[PDB]
Amino acid sequence: TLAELLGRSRIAQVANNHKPLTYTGKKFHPTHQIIETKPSTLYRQEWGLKSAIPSKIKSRYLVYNDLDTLERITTFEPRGGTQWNRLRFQEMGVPIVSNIGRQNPFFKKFNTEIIGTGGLSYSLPGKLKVIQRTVVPGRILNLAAIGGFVADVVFFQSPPSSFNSMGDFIRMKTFLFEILEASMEKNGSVSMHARLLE
Amino acid sequence: KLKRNYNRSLLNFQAHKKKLNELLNLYHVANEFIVTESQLLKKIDKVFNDETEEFTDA
Amino acid sequence: KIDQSLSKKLPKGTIYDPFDFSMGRIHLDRKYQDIMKSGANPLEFYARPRILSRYVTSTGRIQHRDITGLSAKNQRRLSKAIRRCQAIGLM
Amino acid sequence: QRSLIDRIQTRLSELLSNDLKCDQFLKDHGNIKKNLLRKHVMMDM
Amino acid sequence: EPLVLSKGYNIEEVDKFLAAIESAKRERAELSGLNTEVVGIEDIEKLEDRREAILRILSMRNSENKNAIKMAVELARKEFERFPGDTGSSEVQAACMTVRI
Amino acid sequence: MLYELIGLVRITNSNAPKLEAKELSSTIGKLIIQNRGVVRDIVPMGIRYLPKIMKKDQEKHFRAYHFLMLFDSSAAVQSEILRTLKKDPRVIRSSIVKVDLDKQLDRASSLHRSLGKKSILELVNEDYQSI
Amino acid sequence: MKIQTNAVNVLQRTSAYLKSGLLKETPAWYNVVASIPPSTKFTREPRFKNPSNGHIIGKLVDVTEQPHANNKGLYKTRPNSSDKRVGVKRLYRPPKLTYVEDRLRSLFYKQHPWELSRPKILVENEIGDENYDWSHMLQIGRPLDGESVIQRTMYLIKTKQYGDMVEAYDHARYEFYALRMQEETEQQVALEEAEMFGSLFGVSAIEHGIQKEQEVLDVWEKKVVEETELMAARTS
Amino acid sequence: DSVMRKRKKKMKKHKLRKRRKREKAERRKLSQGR
RNA sequence: AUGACCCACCAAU
RNA sequence: AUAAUAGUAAAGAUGAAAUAAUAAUAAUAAUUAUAAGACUAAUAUAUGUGAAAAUAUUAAUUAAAUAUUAACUGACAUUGAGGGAUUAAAACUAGAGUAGCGAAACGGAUUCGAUACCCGUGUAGUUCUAGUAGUAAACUAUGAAUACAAUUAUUUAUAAUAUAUAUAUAAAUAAUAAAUGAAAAUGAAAGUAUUCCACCUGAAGAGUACGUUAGCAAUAAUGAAACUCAAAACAAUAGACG
């Protein structure tokens, strides 16, 4: 049926969300679903949205909130790229305690609160990749953004010269960190610890 | 006609019972005091004599 | 050492991006930068001159619904409470 | 009073399903004959 | 008249409803494992006033003319009605407009 | 009906700050009572320097002892209370505002109503706990 | 614009010219638009039932069709305001295509925001050849997504393998987790194994994460070279 | 036309001046015992 | 073509 | 305005200047302090509320005004000649008041002249109280009522939902479709229709004269004719002009 067809439509497979496309608010979990397009459609300038995406866009990944709007345009930001952060979590290979997983590994009528890893992890907590993890390089904020995830830098002794070496480019400089671990506060926020090798 | 009468009856009924409930919800218990010369002395003399409530907060 | 207006300091909690680490981003943010607002009869605070002291240009002046942005009813009752508080000794 | 509506309505209404059981009923007492249902049904109570 | 009140509060119902409390208070204690002491009179003095205030706080002499009218329209409707309830009869409507007039 | 009097009384006793305030609180009260009407809740608001120097009887009171009395009386008694107040040299800046109880049989003092509360019977079980 | 006439009336128009002399040879197309006459009615035809929620559009609850005093303990007998407010525009008004599955979609994506972050094939391929046995939360062609979980809960509520919608979805929610859990291990295995079997990698997720980031730093560093300094002269 | 309406203004003002002159004749010997 | 005439300027938000 | 105070020579106003009871009587400015009046910032959109006048400093009393159900009434209405009621600003008659404002007045400017614009005093009045009067571009230049007609966005009222959501209703406001229209444009009316009342029939003369009623009065309503023209009016367009 017309509806049956729409009830399975990829357009509807994507849920609605009017969360701002700027969200200046501190961000922990993603706001919208990125729409992936095969390079073919990109040259064909086809993205499956109500209106074709402008050739100015050269990405294959975009995020949309309004198929189309009064302004006679589709409200989309071609900067949908979470595909990188989450993958880097896999590049980082570290599991989350996830409080206590009674019965079900994530445990929990509706699991709105304590949703779980939040699709940030679907691997057995313990594994041997741990072999001291894989000292993943991170960008020290002062805290160190490792694979798009800030982790508080820890060290045997405070090395001021290391910070002085990068001067004000501490974030610009990237140092390998043996991630101690990460955790998902019920607000879906990951808190982790770094190992400044200095 | 019968259902109409019931509709009018239950309405009047609901209002009066609430009236009664609220009347024995406070008039039954409202300080059980202010209304007499003696009591006023008690409350007023049990106000600034020990506690005082102002904003300013915490 | 460096000036503030040139260095985002995303908290660790968030998700930093390659662009996110840019000046463009800083400018971007700037561009896109309340129990009364919650829904409590703002007039009931006809006295408590403390609560009303808030939505006030600090010059005995209430604010146009461009700042306060409280509900028409909430703002008008808040304004009435302020005016009533002027009558009620305190403020 | 509300009780009346119960049984009163309940059987005339119940008669919805009984164009056969009413047969038992129609007799005891004795279209607008459907209206004849409420007729004597009402009297019972 | 003296002792009149608002929202259907006839003084009697008050006397009888207020009274309910008397029965309840004492009977609440008859059972359980707590004995009877000061409740011999439950401050006749205190209960006497409690009701009293209720009366001042529900006395038309201390309410609003609107409320006295709310009582009146009724009185009239009930003196001019065609049957218990009718409130649309021309005389009922007339009588009602009369009180206000 | 239920009225309220957020009046600001003056003070002169370097010592007792709530001298006059309490003495007036008695006055008003004595009269709210001898006249068919129920006093309800009194909520001493203590002292708060007045935002401006409120000159009363050429005394330029820079501060006053705010206080509140929730009362109930006929218009007249309520009106009359106004007269008493302004005309009481002690009080400095009075005020009686109404508290219609058409919906809630018992209304609390404005303050608690902004504290989240709403009724004395409520505000009483609010403390009832104990026994 | 306004329902025009000189648009779907060309044959009528040409015919006249063709019968008089303004034209000598008929416009070739003449026959085609005769064989296939143009739909001329432009009526705002009415609707009677919602194509989706199966609701009906066109009924009134005559009071007799009711007898239970409303929850508001009250036997209503006289028709109510809205119940007499001629609602004809409603029939023409297109109804909303409400779907409980859409709520489940949002619910799952809210509980699993990373699923939204996960690339989805919104581009629909020949939807015709898509008959999918959904007793399993996996299908050939269709990839893994929260949408699969939704189409899955349907069996558990249609076939009724489980009970209500909430319980049904969860049964598949754990079904999904497993597929995702196994995939996570599979993902690492490729590398670990390939990593321990003659494999060289030009750039990894950490590498794009650093190169692009360091690239950005090029701009910021140069930028503050003007901003901070310009202020010294702007204030000295 | 506003200009046409303004002309009324000039005419009413002119008549007002005449009225002032007529006012002298009014309340005089003509409107009393005659 | 009709067709001898045209007359006013004062200084700021 | 008025003393108190200390302070010194200008003040103040304007395009620029003059003056006045400005200031060597010590001013203005300052800071205190008395008194007298009018008014009511923000909020504040006149959103709204009122029949229209009108109307946002606070409270008190009184009164009207909401939606939705429910009970009733049982066409009881649509609105209306005449009548009645209310009716801005000015004006008026009494009584109090009178700070500021400001007709009149008088003075100083400017100007060719300036009984103006500008500036200084500043009286009737603007305030209240009781009146009187009954007119305004009293204009949305749009009489009231009912049934109906295509969309969108915002207010927003309000029910509902499994409040915080996305929905159903109304209400208003803003863009329009159609339709109407001399066009400008009107847009749920200036559309489609029905009902009732008011009013118009070229321009001048004229809302004049006269008569009559009403008013303390100014005036208000009512409201002709002769004489004289082929004129007179409105929306759209070019163009010249500022």
UniProtKB/Swiss-Prot annotation, chain A:
It is found in: Mitochondrion. GO terms for biological process: mitochondrial translation; mitochondrial translational initiation. GO terms for cellular component: mitochondrial inner membrane; mitochondrial small ribosomal subunit; mitochondrion. Keywords: Mitochondrion, Phosphoprotein, Ribonucleoprotein, Ribosomal protein. Pfam families: Mit_ribos_Mrp51. Signal peptide: none annotated. Transmembrane segments: none annotated. GO terms for molecular function: structural constituent of ribosome. InterPro entries: Rbsml_bS1m-like. It comes from the Eukaryota. Belongs to the bacterial ribosomal protein bS1 family. Present with 656 molecules/cell in log phase SD medium. Component of the mitochondrial small ribosomal subunit (mt-SSU). Mature yeast 74S mitochondrial ribosomes consist of a small (37S) and a large (54S) subunit. The 37S small subunit contains a 15S ribosomal RNA (15S mt-rRNA) and 34 different proteins. The 54S large subunit contains a 21S rRNA (21S mt-rRNA) and 46 different proteins. Component of the mitochondrial ribosome (mitoribosome), a dedicated translation machinery responsible for the synthesis of mitochondrial genome-encoded proteins, including at least some of the essential transmembrane subunits of the mitochondrial respiratory chain. The mitoribosomes are attached to the mitochondrial inner membrane and translation products are cotranslationally integrated into the membrane. bS1m functionally interacts with the 5'-UTR of mitochondrial mRNAs. The gene is MRP51.
UniProtKB/Swiss-Prot annotation, chain C:
GO terms for biological process: mitochondrial translation. GO terms for molecular function: small ribosomal subunit rRNA binding; structural constituent of ribosome. One of its GO terms (cellular component) is mitochondrial small ribosomal subunit. It is found in: Mitochondrion. Keywords: Mitochondrion, Ribonucleoprotein, Ribosomal protein, Transit peptide. Belongs to the bacterial ribosomal protein bS18 family. It comes from Saccharomyces cerevisiae (strain RM11-1a) (Baker's yeast). Component of the mitochondrial small ribosomal subunit. Mature mitochondrial ribosomes consist of a small (37S) and a large (54S) subunit. The 37S subunit contains at least 33 different proteins and 1 molecule of RNA (15S). The 54S subunit contains at least 45 different proteins and 1 molecule of RNA (21S). This is Small ribosomal subunit protein bS18m. Disulfide bonds: none annotated. The keyword Ribonucleoprotein applies. The gene is RSM18. The chain holds residues 40 to 138 of 138 of the full protein. It comes from the Eukaryota. The keyword Transit peptide applies.
Swiss-Prot record, chain E:
It comes from the Eukaryota. Transmembrane segments: none annotated. The precursor is processed in two steps involving mitochondrial intermediate peptidase (MIP) and mitochondrial processing peptidase (MPP). It is found in: Mitochondrion. Present with 6960 molecules/cell in log phase SD medium. Component of the mitochondrial small ribosomal subunit (mt-SSU). Mature yeast 74S mitochondrial ribosomes consist of a small (37S) and a large (54S) subunit. The 37S small subunit contains a 15S ribosomal RNA (15S mt-rRNA) and 34 different proteins. The 54S large subunit contains a 21S rRNA (21S mt-rRNA) and 46 different proteins. Belongs to the universal ribosomal protein uS15 family. Component of the mitochondrial ribosome (mitoribosome), a dedicated translation machinery responsible for the synthesis of mitochondrial genome-encoded proteins, including at least some of the essential transmembrane subunits of the mitochondrial respiratory chain. The mitoribosomes are attached to the mitochondrial inner membrane and translation products are cotranslationally integrated into the membrane. This is Small ribosomal subunit protein uS15m. The lineage of its organism: Eukaryota, Fungi, Dikarya, Ascomycota, Saccharomycotina. The gene is MRPS28. The chain holds residues 85 to 185 of 286 of the full protein.
UniProtKB/Swiss-Prot annotation, chain H:
Residues 5-22 have a biased composition (Basic residues). Residues 23-34 have a biased composition (Basic and acidic residues). Residues 5-34 are annotated as: Disordered. Transmembrane segments: none annotated. It is found in: Mitochondrion; Mitochondrion inner membrane. Component of the mitochondrial small ribosomal subunit (mt-SSU). Mature yeast 74S mitochondrial ribosomes consist of a small (37S) and a large (54S) subunit. The 37S small subunit contains a 15S ribosomal RNA (15S mt-rRNA) and 34 different proteins. The 54S large subunit contains a 21S rRNA (21S mt-rRNA) and 46 different proteins. Component of the mitochondrial ribosome (mitoribosome), a dedicated translation machinery responsible for the synthesis of mitochondrial genome-encoded proteins, including at least some of the essential transmembrane subunits of the mitochondrial respiratory chain. The mitoribosomes are attached to the mitochondrial inner membrane and translation products are cotranslationally integrated into the membrane. mS38 is also involved in the splicing of the COX1 mRNA. Belongs to the mitochondrion-specific ribosomal protein mS38 family. This is Small ribosomal subunit protein mS38. It comes from Saccharomyces cerevisiae (strain ATCC 204508 / S288c). The lineage of its organism: Eukaryota, Fungi, Dikarya, Ascomycota, Saccharomycotina. The chain holds residues 78 to 111 of 111 of the full protein.
